[PDB]
């Protein structure tokens with residue numbers, strides 16, 4: 001319970017998600033207070049939001065002109081940009097990118113919501 | 118209010134000297150998040166330390182050859198994108214040069230550092 005854990009994000013089996021591929025660590029079973037994903041943005045995705053989870057993206061690399069959209073506002077991605085996304089904030093990434101997604105509390109896939117067209 | 122998104126370039130934050138090197142700390146206590154994110158450059162030897170009220174997760178972005186992390190007296194090698202969860206009271210430090218992202222929970226408190 002109070003034991004350190006060690007995981008290689010790059011070696012974790014990658015799973016498909018709407019925006020690309022996710023390598024997820026420290027889920028709810030792990031006892032940690034947050035999940036840590038190493039996520040490859042390869043494809044465009046619906047704008048979405050979370051009702052119970054706040055996310056913090058940390059950009060590790062990105063394609064030129066890649067942006068992030070927060071409540072309909074667009075901002076360019078740069079290296080080591082950190083973005084805090086509280087619950088209810090509509091968000092998505094546009095263009096290719098690699099990020100560390102820090103989720104609290106631990107990530108729960110059930111908590112994904114969309115606005116209709 | 119912590120209802121609003123926030124945005125900060127870790128590489129542009131004023132670097133603060135800490136025992137192990139230099140830290141660029143974002144989303145501190147006041148930011149209204151549940152965690153702090155530090156972009157920390159480990160450049161020097163540091164005494165083995167521990168935290169009494171804080172979980173830490175290191176994510177190694179880069180490291181010099183043969184660099185290690187020590188946890189409760191055990192040495193393991195560092196590798197790129199190695200993630201280490203360090204619960205409260207786990208004695209630990211990094212030996213050798215490295216660049217990490219340090220995720221702290223609850224938000225960072227500089228008072229909480231022990232020996």
Ligand SMILES: [Cu+2]
Nearest residue numbers: 048049050055
């Ligand atoms: Cu999200």
Ligand SMILES: [Cu+2]
Nearest residue numbers: 166167168173
């Ligand atoms: Cu520490």
